[PDB]
Paper text:
Prior to obtaining crystals of full-length E269A-substituted GG-SpaA, this mutant protein had fortuitously degraded to only the N-domain during crystallization. Up to now, the crystal structure of an N-terminal domain from a Gram-positive pilin has never been determined before by X-ray crystallography, largely because of its rather flexible nature. Yet, for these particular crystals of the E269A mutant, all N-domain residues were easily built into the electron density map, with the exception of Thr55-Ile57 in the AB loop. Here, the crystal structure of the N-domain exhibited a major conformational change at the domain interface region, but with the overall fold still retained (RMSD of 1 Å). However, isopeptide bonding between Lys47 and Asn172 was no longer visible in the structure. Upon further inspection of the structure, residues (170–180) encompassing the domain linker region exhibit a 34 Å movement towards the AB loop. This structural rearrangement has caused Asn172 to shift 3.5 Å away from its normal WT position, which subsequently prevents isopeptide bond formation. Moreover, the NH group of the Lys47 side chain shows a ∼160° rotation toward Glu139 and forms a salt bridge. The localized perturbations caused by the displacement of the linker region has disrupted its hydrogen-bonding interactions with the neighboring AB and EF loops, thereby moving each of them away (5 and 7 Å, respectively) from the linker residues. From the structure it appears that the C-terminal tail of GG-SpaA (β-strand G) must be properly positioned to create a favorable molecular environment that then facilitates isopeptide bonding in the N-domain.
As the first reported host of “non-pathogenic-derived” pili, Lactobacillus rhamnosus GG is a gut-adapted commensal lactic acid bacterium (LAB) and one of many clinically investigated probiotic strains for human use in the prevention and treatment of certain gastric ailments. As with other Gram-positive bacteria, sortase-dependent piliation in L. rhamnosus GG (called SpaCBA) is assembled from the ~30 kDa SpaA (backbone), ~20 kDa SpaB (basal), and ~90 kDa SpaC (tip-located) pilins. Two immunoglobulin (Ig)-like subdomains comprise GG-SpaA, each having the conserved residues of a canonical E-box motif and internal isopeptide bonds formed between either lysine and asparagine or lysine and aspartate residues. Our findings show that the GG-SpaA structure has certain features in common with other pathogen-derived pilin-proteins, such as the Ig-like CnaB-type folds and the presence of internal isopeptide bonds6940.
Numbering used by the authors: 39 to 180
The structure:
């Protein structure tokens, strides 16, 4: 049993303000531009998550790759993801996936890593809609 995850990548726009967007609503981006040709790797982080849910902060170390994708013309990619997977003990668990932009990571329009805890609320068309946010900042330490 899988869900159909539709990812849409919109570039930063000074006039749209980046509130959260639920997985069961279509958001047109409010004029911001879809970003084409952005490569994402989707890691199955179910094991890393279930090692300790209360401590999970987005690590995908040693996580297997669930899928890769590249945004199209409309800034979108679609991927069916299993709603359950296995933890490190081999026990069946609700699945968690980490979306990581590998390319082009264009500065302030780089997507922040985000993770997704299935099953999610689906829209009427049956899709799960995610909208990666741009990174909080372009300076870093540590
Ligand atoms: Na696809």
């Amino acid at each position: 049993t899988t869900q159909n995850v539709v990812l849409t990548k919109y570039g930063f726009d000074k006039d749209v303000t980046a509130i959260d967007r639920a997985t069961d609503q279509i958001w047109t981006g409010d004029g911001a531009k879809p970003l084409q040709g952005v490569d994402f790797t989707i890691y199955n982080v179910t094991a890393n998550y279930w090692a300790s849910p209360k401590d999970y902060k987005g690590s995908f170390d040693s996580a297997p790759v669930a899928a890769t994708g590249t945004t199209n013309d409309k800034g979108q990619l679609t991927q069916a993801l299993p709603i359950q997977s296995k933890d490190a003990s081999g026990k069946t668990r609700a699945a968690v996936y980490l979306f990581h932009e590998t390319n082009p990571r264009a500065g302030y329009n780089t997507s922040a890593d985000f993770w997704l805890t299935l099953p999610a609320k689906a829209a009427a068309d049956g899709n799960v809609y995610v909208y990666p946010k741009n990174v909080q900042k372009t300076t870093y330490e540590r």
